[PDB]
Write a protein that binds this ligand. Structure first.
Ligand SMILES: O=C(O)[C@@H]1O[C@@H](O)[C@H](OS(=O)(=O)O)[C@@H](O)C1O[C@H]1O[C@H](COS(=O)(=O)O)[C@@H](O[C@@H]2O[C@@H](C(=O)O)[C@@H](O[C@H]3O[C@H](COS(=O)(=O)O)[C@H](O[C@@H]4O[C@@H](C(=O)O)[C@H](O[C@H]5O[C@H](COS(=O)(=O)O)[C@@H](O[C@@H]6O[C@@H](C(=O)O)[C@H](O[C@H]7O[C@H](COS(=O)(=O)O)[C@@H](O[C@@H]8O[C@@H](C(=O)O)[C@@H](O[C@H]9O[C@H](COS(=O)(=O)O)[C@@H](O)[C@H](O)[C@H]9NS(=O)(=O)O)[C@H](O)[C@H]8OS(=O)(=O)O)[C@H](O)[C@H]7NS(=O)(=O)O)[C@H](O)[C@H]6OS(=O)(=O)O)[C@H](O)[C@H]5NS(=O)(=O)O)[C@H](O)[C@H]4OS(=O)(=O)O)[C@H](O)[C@H]3NS(=O)(=O)O)[C@H](O)[C@H]2OS(=O)(=O)O)[C@H](O)[C@H]1NS(=O)(=O)O
Ligand SMILES: [Cu+2]
Ligand SMILES: [Zn+2]
Lengths: 204, 921, 179, 213
C-alpha cells in the first residue's frame, strides 16, 4: 500500500486548451484525475468559487468522470476555467480557456418597409436602403429576379443570383430608367436563417 | 354472425350530413311488397259462429268487459274488408288463421267446413283484387282444448298438433299463399303468455316457464318449417318464416360497457329467437351464460334442425313490444328508442344480410279517436321513411312493409283503449263499416307513388332577386360600451426623446377635450369590420328603452347612450350598410321597458303607450338623420302577452308611427312599420277540413291579432272575435272609431320574422299536450330536419306564410326581418344552417318570382354568437370572432343576388322603382 | 433558392402558450376557473393565454378560458383572479440573455414559476426550475374553445307506458288569461 | 439469457413529450432500451430516415449511449421524431416532439415609413398607422406635440407630448389613429412610441392641413 501520487485516465483525450463553442452550443469540461484512494475535485473560474447557482442556464456535476456540463452556453461564461484536484498528499492543477462567440437566437431581421418603392428617373438615382439589426455583420444580399415568364410570385424555387455587396447598408441604383423592373429583396441571413423583405416596388 | 351488429351504434353515433339526409325523398325499389296487416282475434270476431272452437283469448277476456267476441265483425264481413284493400292500393294482405276456428274439436279430427269456407272466400276475394296473401298460422290464439289438456305451449306435444294444423293450412290454402308466418311474436307468446301472465294464457308461473315455452315455440316452428320444405314447397314454392318482434335500445352514457349492454339486451329479446333460426340453431352466448340453469339446453340434433328454418326475416316493430310489452329487466338499464333505421341495420349486420320483410309496424292512437288520426299517420310516415333510408343509405335488403291493423279491433291486453287501424270502425255501431282514416289516405298515396318521389314544390329555383334587395343581418342585442378609447387622455406629458423615451406628466397645464367623433368608440369599428366582410347591405339592431331613458320619463336622458347609437348608425352608413333600427324589443327582464314604467302593469296602463310615443319621438330626432328604416315593435310575443297588453301595444305603435309620419318623414325620408313573428301553421292532415279551419284560427291568434288592426280592416280579426265570443270570454277589447282610424294604416311595409312551421290537429290525442284554449293539438312532422333545440327545418313554410300574408293583407312590401336557425354544437350543426339558409332563401325567391310577392328584403338572424348565443353567423370563441361556414355561403348568395343559373345575368339597375324603398317622394 | 420569409414579431396580442423545461419534462402554463395553476403536458384550450403589456416592460397574463387574471401573493405562488389589480397581479417580463422569458412581480421580487421554488430574481444567476418560460403560438383550433356543456338528459315521463316516444306532439308555451 | 421483450431502461427520464428551445440551442433525444440483445436505433423524421445528410452543422453520434444530439437547432427542424429501434421479438417506439422557436431580444422595430408624411385637406379623414414588430408584448402609444406656453420644448429640452391612443386591456387597433374632419389644430408631429422590456423606439410623421387643396 504505497502513497497516493496518481495521474489522470486519458491524457490526450482530456486536454484541448481551446474551445471556440458558438453561443447556445452545449459543451462540458472534464478533469478525470483518478487514483487510490479517490481524491476530491473542485472547479473554479476567474479565481472565484464556482457553483451551479451563479451561472445562467445551469450546470450539472457528474461523478462517472467528474465533469461539469454547460447546456446552452452563454457569452457571459467568458474567462478562465481552472480545475483543482487534490489528493491526500499533493495536488494537481489544470487550466481551461473558453471564448464563446456570439450567436444570436434569431435570423437577422431588418426594418420593414425597406427596401422602399423604386420610382425615379435619370438625374435622381434610386437610393435603396435596408438596415439589419444584428450583433456582428450579417450576410445581406439583394437577389434581383431574372425576368422569365413574369417570375415574381411562383413556386419550385426561383434562384436568380445577383451580387453587388455583402456586409445599415444602402445601394445606389445608378441610371434608373425603364429597363430594370420587378420586385426587389434584401436577403439578410446568417447561420440561423435567411430573411428578406419587399413592398409594392413598381418602377417605370 | 352474432356480435357483428355491435358496431351499429358506432355508425349512427356521428350525425348524418343534413344535405343528403335533408331532402332525401327516395323511391322504394321495384317489386316492393306493400302490405297491410290483420289478425284473427283483433278483427275477425264471431267467437262461436259456425262451430268455432275456443281460443285461449276467448277464455282470457272472460276469465272464468273489453272482450273480442265481436271486435270488428270481420268474420261475417269479407266484402268490406277486401274493398278496403282494393281502395288502399295494397298488394299484400297479412292476415292470420284462427287455430280454434279451422280445427275446433281436435287437430286429428274433422276440420270445420264453415271455418275453412270463410278463409277460402277471403283468399278468393284476395285473388280477384290481385292482393297476394301473407298468412300467419298462429297469432296468439291457441285453442283452449290444447291449454287445459296438454297445459299449453309448455308441453312438447303441441309441436305435433301445430304441425298437423299447419299441414291443413298448407294443403288447403297453398296454391294461393306463398308467404307464411309460423308464429307471430314468439316473445310475447312465451314471455307474457306464461312467464308474466299479461297475455292470453293466465299463468304467471316463472321466467323458467317463459324460457321453456319459447324453447317449444322454436321446436314447433322448426317442425312446421321442415313440414313445408319437405312436403309442400316443391309443389308450391312458398316461403315460411317467424314474425320476430323487437325493440331498439340506446346506450346510457355511450361507453364500451353500455354498447355491450345494449347488444346484450338485443340478444335477449331478438337474438333469443333469430339466432336459433337464422345463424346456427343455438341461443346467443350472452343469454346462455348468466341464466344457464333456468334456460333449457338444445340437443345437437335439434340445433341443426332449427338452423335455417326461415326463408326471410319477419320483423314486428310496433307498439306491441316497443315501450309496452318489453320486460324492463330485458333492457339491462338502458335507453329504449323507437328507431327503425338503426334496427334494420342491426339485423343486416348480425344475421348475414337477410331479406327483411317488415310484417308489422305503425303506432297507436287513443281509443277515443275517429277518422282523424294525425299522430298515427306521422309515425307511419317516419317508419316508412326509416326503411327507405335503410334500403338506400344502409344497404339493408328490405323486401316489404306492412302497416299493421288494416282496421280497428281488439288490441290484445289494452282492449279497445287504443286504436291502430288504418280504417275507422265504429264498435258501438251494429254495421261496423270501414271508414278510411287520415293514415289510410296517406298510405294509399304512398303506395301509389311508391315511396317519397321528389316534388316540384321543393325543387330549387334558379333565379335572381331584384335589384336594391335588402340583403341584411340582424343583431337584437348589440353590445354597447361607451368606452372612449381615442383622444380620452387630456394631460400634458414631457418626453425624454433622447434620454429614456418615457413620459413625465406636467401638473398644472392641461388641454381641452377635442370634439368627440365616432372613432372614439372601441367596439363600433370591429363590428362594422365583420359586417363589411359579410357583404351585407343592411344591418338590423334594436335600441334599449331602459338605457336611453332609465327612469322612463323624458326628464333625464342618457345622451352618451344616444351618441353610441347615433355613431353606430353613422358609421354603418359610411361603409354603405343601411341601418334598420327597432325602437322596442320584448326580450328583456322588464319586457323591454324602463324599470319605472315596468312596475305598474308594464303594458296595461295606457300611459305606457303615451310614454312610448315620446320615447319614439326622441329616437327619431337624434338617430333619425342616419336611420331611414324604423321598426316600432320588434316581434312582440303574441302568445305570451295579455289582451290589454296587446291593446296598448297596438296603440303604442300607432302613436309612434303617427309621430314619425307627421313630424319627421318630411325632413328625413325614411320608413317605419311593425315587425311581427310570422311562423307558418299547417294542418296536420292535408285533406281534413276541420284541420284547415283550426290552422286558420291559430294563424289569426298568432299573426292576425296584431296585423289585422294595422294591415287589414283596422279591427281585431273576425275569427278571433268569434272564437272568444262563443267561448264566453269577452276579454278582447273593442276598437273605437278614433282608435280604429289611428291604427288603420300605421305601416310602411310588412316586416315578418319566420323561423319554422307547426302542424295543428283538431282532434285531441291526449289532453296533457292539448291547447284547450284554442282547441288545437300542436304536432310536428318527425321526418323534418331538426335543430338541437328541436326546431323544424321547413323551407316551404316561408313561401306559404308569405302568400298567406299577401292574400290576407293585400300586395304589400314584405321584409323578412329575421329568419335563422341555431346550432347546438360547434361545427357539426352549422352544415344544417347553410342548408337552412340556402333553402329558406330559395323558397323566398320562389315566393317572389312564382307568386309575384313584393318581397324586398331578407335578414339572416343574429350577427354573432356573443350577442345572440347559438344563433350567430360568427363564432365567438376566446373573445375572437370567426366566420362560420354559413357566413361564407351567405356571402355567395348576397354577391350573386339570389341563385343565378348557369348562364344568366341582369344588368346594373340605376334608380329602380320597386315600391319598397325611399324614392324621390 | 427557396423563399420562406416568416415574419418575426407577430405575437403582439395573439394567443400564446407559456412553455418551460427542466431537462426532465415539459409543461405548459395553465389557469383553471377555481384559481388552480398547474402545468399541462401539451397545449390545451385551458392553457391558451393572452399577454397584454400596459407599461414599457410590464405584462399581464389572463387566459381566455378561465376568464381569470394570473395574480400572485406574498409567498410566491400564483393563481387566477376574476378581478384585476395593478399591485401584485402584474409582472415585469424580462427576456434572459439565453433567449428565455422570465416573469416576476416588480414589488415582490419573486419569479413566476410552475414549480414550488419561489426564489428571488437577480440579474445573472441560475433561476429556479420551471421558470424560464418560452412563448408558443396557439396552434389549437379556436372551434374547440366553445363550451359543449348544453347536454340534456330526460328522466321524467320515462317508463314502460310511453305513448309518444318520437315526440310528434309538441305543445307550445302559451298563456291563457282567466277572469 | 431469456429472450425478453425490449423495454425502456430508464422510464423516469422519458416524460418530456415536447421539446422547445430557442434557435441555436442543442436538444437531447435520449432513449435507452433493451432487447435480445439491444438492437440498433435508427432515428427517422416524420417517416423519412433521419441521419447526418439532411442537415449539415453537426450531428453527434452516440449509439453506445443510445441518444441523439442535435447541435445548433435551426428554425427548419420542427417535427416529431421517433426512437425507433426494432427487436426480433418486440417493436417499441416513443415519439420525441421538437418545436424550435425564434426569439427577438430587441426593442420594438417599427415599419419604416409608417407613419408617413401624409397631408390632407381641411375637413378630410386622415389615418396614421405604425406597424410594430416585437415578439415580446409591446406598448403602443400615440403622441402629439404641443406648443402649450412657448415653443414645443419643455423645462429641460423635452418636447411636450399629449397621449391620444393607448394600449389598454380592452383597446385594440392601437397602431392606427383616426383623425376625421381635421382642423387647423390637427397638424403637427405625430410619433408612435412603442416599447417593451428591452427598450423603446418611436417613429415620427408630420401631418399638414391644406385649406385649399
Ligand atoms: O429544495 C428546494 O429548493 C425545493 O424545496 C421545495 O420547495 C420543493 O418541495 S415541493 O414538494 O414543494 O416540490 C422541492 O422540490 C425543491 O426543489 C426545487 O428546486 C430544486 C433546485 O434547487 S435549486 O438549488 O436548483 O434551485 C429543483 O430540483 C432539481 O431537481 C431535483 C430532482 O430531480 O429531484 C434535484 O436533483 C438531485 O436529485 C435528482 C434525483 O432525481 S430523482 O428522479 O431521483 O428525484 C438527480 O439525481 C441523482 O443524482 C444524479 C447525480 O449523479 O448527481 C444521478 O443523475 C443525474 O445525472 C446523471 C449523470 O450520470 S452520471 O453517471 O454522470 O452521474 C444522469 O445521467 C445519465 O447518465 C449519463 C452518463 O452516461 O454519464 C448520461 O450521459 C451524458 O453525459 C455524459 C458525459 O458527457 S461529458 O461531456 O461529461 O463527457 C456523456 O458522454 C458523451 O458521450 C461519450 C460517448 O460518445 O460515448 C463521449 O465521447 C468519448 O468518445 C468520443 C469518440 O469520438 S467520437 O467520434 O465518437 O465522438 C471521444 O471523441 C471523446 O473524447 C470521448 N469523451 S470522454 O468523456 O469519454 O473522454 C463524449 O465525449 C461524452 O461527452 S459529451 O459532451 O458528448 O456528452 C453521455 O453520452 C451523455 N448523454 S447525451 O447523449 O445526452 O449527451 C445521461 O446524462 C444520462 O444517461 S441515461 O441513459 O442513463 O439516462 C441522470 O439522468 C441525472 N438525473 S435524472 O433525474 O435526469 O435521472 C442519479 O442517478 C440521480 O439519482 S436517481 O435516483 O434519480 O437515479 C439530480 O441530478 C440531483 N442533483 S445533482 O446536483 O446531484 O445533479 C435537485 O433539487 C435539482 O436538480 S439539480 O440537478 O439541478 O441539482 C426542484 O425540481 C424544485 N422543485 S419545484 O417544486 O419547485 O419544482
Ligand atoms: Cu438579437
Ligand atoms: Zn287531423
Amino acid at each position: 500500500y504505497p502513497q497516493q501520487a496518481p495521474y489522470w485516465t486519458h491524457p490526450q483525450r482530456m486536454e484541448k486548451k481551446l474551445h471556440a463553442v458558438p453561443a447556445g452550443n452545449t459543451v462540458k469540461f472534464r478533469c478525470p484525475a483518478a487514483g487510490n484512494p479517490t481524491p476530491t475535485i473542485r472547479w473554479l473560474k476567474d479565481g472565484q468559487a464556482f457553483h451551479g447557482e451563479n451561472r445562467i442556464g445551469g450546470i450539472r456535476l457528474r461523478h462517472q468522470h467528474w465533469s461539469l456540463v454547460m447546456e446552452s452556453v452563454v457569452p457571459s461564461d467568458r474567462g478562465t476555467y481552472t480545475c483543482l484536484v487534490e489528493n491526500a498528499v499533493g495536488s494537481i492543477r489544470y487550466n481551461y480557456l473558453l471564448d464563446v462567440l456570439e450567436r444570436s437566437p434569431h435570423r437577422p431581421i431588418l426594418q420593414a418597409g425597406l427596401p422602399a418603392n423604386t420610382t425615379a428617373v435619370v438625374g435622381s438615382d434610386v437610393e435603396l436602403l435596408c438596415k439589419v439589426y444584428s450583433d456582428a455583420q450579417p450576410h445581406i444580399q439583394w437577389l434581383k429576379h431574372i425576368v422569365i415568364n413574369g417570375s415574381s410570385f411562383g413556386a419550385d424555387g426561383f434562384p436568380y443570383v445577383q451580387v453587388l455587396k455583402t456586409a445599415v447598408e444602402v445601394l445606389y441604383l445608378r441610371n434608373v430608367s425603364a429597363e430594370d423592373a420587378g420586385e426587389y429583396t434584401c436577403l439578410a441571413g446568417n447561420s440561423i436563417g435567411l430573411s428578406y423583405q419587399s413592398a409594392w416596388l413598381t418602377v417605370l | 354472425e352474432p356480435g357483428d351488429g355491435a358496431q351499429t351504434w358506432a355508425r349512427f353515433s356521428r350525425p348524418p350530413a343534413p344535405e343528403a339526409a335533408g331532402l332525401f325523398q327516395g323511391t322504394f325499389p321495384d317489386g316492393f311488397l306493400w302490405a297491410v296487416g290483420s289478425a284473427a282475434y283483433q278483427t275477425e270476431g264471431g267467437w262461436q259462429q259456425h262451430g268455432k272452437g275456443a281460443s285461449i283469448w276467448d277464455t282470457f277476456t272472460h276469465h272464468p268487459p273489453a272482450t273480442g267476441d265481436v271486435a270488428s265483425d270481420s268474420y261475417n264481413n269479407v266484402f268490406r274488408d277486401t274493398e278496403a284493400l282494393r281502395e288502399l292500393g295494397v298488394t299484400h294482405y297479412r292476415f292470420s288463421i284462427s287455430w280454434a276456428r279451422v280445427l275446433p274439436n281436435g287437430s286429428a279430427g274433422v276440420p270445420n267446413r264453415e271455418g275453412l269456407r270463410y278463409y277460402r272466400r277471403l283468399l278468393e276475394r284476395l285473388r280477384e283484387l290481385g292482393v297476394q296473401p301473407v298468412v300467419t298460422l298462429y297469432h296468439w290464439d291457441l285453442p283452449q282444448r290444447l291449454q287445459d289438456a296438454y297445459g299449453g305451449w309448455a308441453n312438447r306435444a303441441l309441436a305435433d298438433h301445430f304441425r298437423d294444423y299447419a299441414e291443413l293450412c298448407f294443403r288447403h290454402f297453398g296454391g294461393q299463399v306463398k308467404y307464411w308466418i309460423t308464429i307471430d311474436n314468439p316473445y310475447v307468446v312465451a314471455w307474457h303468455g306464461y312467464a308474466t301472465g299479461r297475455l292470453a294464457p293466465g299463468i304467471r308461473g316463472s321466467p323458467r316457464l317463459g324460457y321453456l315455452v319459447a324453447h317449444n315455440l322454436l321446436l314447433a316452428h322448426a317442425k312446421v318449417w321442415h313440414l313445408y320444405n319437405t312436403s309442400f314447397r316443391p309443389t308450391q314454392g312458398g316461403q315460411v318464416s317467424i314474425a320476430l318482434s323487437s325493440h331498439w335500445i340506446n346506450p346510457r352514457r355511450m361507453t364500451d360497457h353500455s354498447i355491450k349492454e345494449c347488444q346484450k339486451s338485443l340478444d335477449f329479446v331478438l337474438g333469443w329467437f333469430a339466432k336459433p333460426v337464422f345463424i346456427d340453431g343455438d341461443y346467443p352466448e350472452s343469454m346462455k351464460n348468466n341464466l344457464s340453469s333456468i334456460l333449457p339446453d338444445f340437443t345437437e340434433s335439434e340445433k341443426k334442425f332449427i338452423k335455417g328454418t326461415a326463408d326471410f326475416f319477419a320483423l314486428c316493430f310496433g307498439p306491441t313490444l316497443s315501450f309496452q310489452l318489453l320486460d324492463p329487466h330485458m333492457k339491462f338499464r338502458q335507453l329504449e328508442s323507437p328507431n327503425l333505421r338503426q334496427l334494420l341495420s342491426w339485423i343486416d349486420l348480425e344475421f348475414n344480410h337477410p331479406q327483411i320483410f317488415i310484417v308489422e309496424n305503425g303506432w297507436f292512437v287513443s281509443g277515443t279517436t275517429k277518422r282523424d288520426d294525425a299522430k298515427y299517420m306521422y309515425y307511419l310516415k317516419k317508419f316508412i321513411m326509416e326503411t327507405l333510408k335503410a334500403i338506400k343509405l344502409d344497404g339493408v335488403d328490405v323486401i316489404g312493409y306492412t302497416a299493421w291493423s288494416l282496421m280497428d279491433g281488439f288490441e290484445w291486453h289494452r282492449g279497445y283503449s287504443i286504436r291502430r287501424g288504418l280504417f275507422y270502425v265504429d264498435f258501438l255501431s251494429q254495421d261496423k263499416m270501414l271508414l278510411p282514416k287520415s293514415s289510410a289516405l296517406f298510405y294509399q298515396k304512398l303506395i301509389e307513388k311508391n315511396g317519397f318521389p321528389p316534388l316540384p314544390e321543393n325543387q330549387p329555383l334558379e333565379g335572381t332577386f331584384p335589384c336594391d334587395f335588402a340583403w341584411g343581418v340582424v343583431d337584437n342585442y348589440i353590445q354597447v360600451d361607451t368606452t372612449l378609447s381615442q383622444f380620452t387622455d387630456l394631460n400634458v406629458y414631457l418626453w425624454d426623446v433622447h434620454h429614456s423615451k418615457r413620459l413625465i406628466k406636467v401638473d398644472g397645464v392641461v388641454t381641452k377635450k377635442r370634439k368627440s367623433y365616432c372613432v372614439d368608440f372601441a367596439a363600433i369599428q370591429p363590428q362594422i369590420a365583420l359586417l363589411q366582410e359579410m357583404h351585407v347591405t343592411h344591418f338590423r339592431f334594436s335600441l334599449d328603452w331602459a338605457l336611453i331613458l332609465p327612469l322612463g320619463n323624458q326628464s333625464q336622458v342618457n345622451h352618451t347612450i344616444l351618441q353610441y347609437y347615433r355613431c353606430m348608425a353613422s358609421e354603418l352608413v359610411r361603409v354603405n350598410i343601411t341601418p334598420v333600427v327597432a325602437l322596442w324589443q320584448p326580450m328583456a327582464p322588464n319586457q323591454g321597458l324602463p324599470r319605472l314604467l315596468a312596475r305598474q302593469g308594464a303594458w296595461e296602463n295606457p300611459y305606457t303607450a303615451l310614454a312610448f310615443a315620446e320615447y319614439a319621438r326622441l329616437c327619431f330626432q337624434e338617430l333619425g338623420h342616419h336611420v331611414k328604416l324604423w321598426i316600432t315593435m320588434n316581434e312582440p310575443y303574441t302568445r305570451n302577452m295579455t289582451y290589454s297588453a296587446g291593446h296598448n301595444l297596438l296603440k303604442a305603435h300607432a302613436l309612434a308611427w303617427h309621430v314619425y309620419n307627421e313630424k319627421f318623414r318630411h325632413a328625413q325620408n325614411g320608413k317605419i312599420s311593425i315587425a311581427l313573428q310570422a311562423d307558418w301553421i299547417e294542418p296536420a292532415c292535408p285533406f281534413s277540413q276541420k284541420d284547415k279551419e283550426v290552422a286558420e284560427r291559430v294563424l289569426e291568434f298568432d299573426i292576425g291579432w296584431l296585423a289585422e288592426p294595422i294591415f287589414g280592416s283596422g279591427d281585431y280579426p273576425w275569427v278571433m272575435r268569434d272564437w272568444l265570443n262563443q267561448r264566453n270570454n269577452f276579454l278582447l277589447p273593442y276598437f273605437t272609431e278614433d282608435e280604429k282610424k289611428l291604427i288603420q294604416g300605421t305601416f310602411d311595409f310588412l316586416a315578418l320574422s319566420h323561423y319554422t312551421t307547426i302542424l295543428v290537429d283538431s282532434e285531441k290525442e291526449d289532453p296533457i299536450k292539448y291547447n284547450d284554449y284554442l282547441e288545437v293539438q300542436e304536432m310536428t312532422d318527425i321526418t323534418w330536419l331538426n335543430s338541437p333545440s328541436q326546431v323544424a327545418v321547413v323551407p316551404w313554410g316561408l313561401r306559404k306564410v308569405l302568400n298567406w300574408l299577401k292574400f290576407k293583407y293585400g300586395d304589400l312590401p314584405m321584409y323578412i326581418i329575421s329568419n335563422g336557425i341555431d346550432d347546438g354544437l360547434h361545427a357539426e350543426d352549422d352544415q344544417l344552417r347553410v342548408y337552412y339558409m340556402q333553402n329558406y332563401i330559395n323558397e323566398a325567391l320562389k315566393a317572389h318570382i312564382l307568386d309575384g310577392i313584393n318581397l324586398c328584403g331578407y335578414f339572416a338572424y343574429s350577427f354573432n354568437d356573443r350577442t345572440a348565443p347559438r344563433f350567430g353567423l360568427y363564432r365567438y370563441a376566446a373573445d375572437q370572432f370567426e366566420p362560420k361556414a354559413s357566413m361564407k355561403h351567405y356571402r355567395k348568395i348576397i354577391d350573386s343576388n339570389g341563385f343565378p343559373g348557369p348562364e344568366t345575368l341582369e344588368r346594373f339597375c340605376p334608380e329602380e322603382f320597386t315600391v319598397c324603398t325611399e324614392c324621390s317622394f | 433558392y427557396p423563399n420562406a420569409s416568416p415574419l418575426l414579431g407577430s405575437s403582439w396580442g395573439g394567443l400564446i402558450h407559456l412553455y418551460t423545461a427542466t431537462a426532465r419534462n415539459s409543461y405548459h402554463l395553465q389557469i383553471h376557473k377555481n384559481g388552480h395553476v398547474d402545468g399541462a403536458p401539451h397545449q390545451t384550450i385551458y392553457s391558451a393565454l393572452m399577454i397584454r403589456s400596459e407599461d414599457a416592460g410590464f405584462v399581464v397574463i389572463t387566459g381566455v378560458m378561465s376568464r381569470r387574471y394570473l395574480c400572485m401573493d406574498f409567498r410566491g405562488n400564483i393563481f387566477g383572479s376574476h378581478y384585476f389589480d395593478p399591485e401584485n397581479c402584474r409582472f415585469q417580463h424580462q427576456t434572459l440573455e439565453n433567449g428565455y422569458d422570465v416573469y416576476h412581480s416588480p414589488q415582490y421580487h419573486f419569479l413566476v414559476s410552475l414549480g414550488r421554488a419561489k426564489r428571488a430574481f437577480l440579474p445573472g444567476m441560475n433561476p429556479p426550475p420551471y421558470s424560464q418560460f418560452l412563448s408558443r403560438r396557439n396552434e389549437i383550433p379556436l372551434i374547440h374553445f366553445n363550451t359543449p356543456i348544453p347536454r340534456q338528459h330526460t328522466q321524467s315521463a320515462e317508463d314502460d307506458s310511453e305513448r309518444d316516444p318520437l315526440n310528434v306532439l309538441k305543445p307550445r308555451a302559451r298563456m291563457t288569461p282567466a277572469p
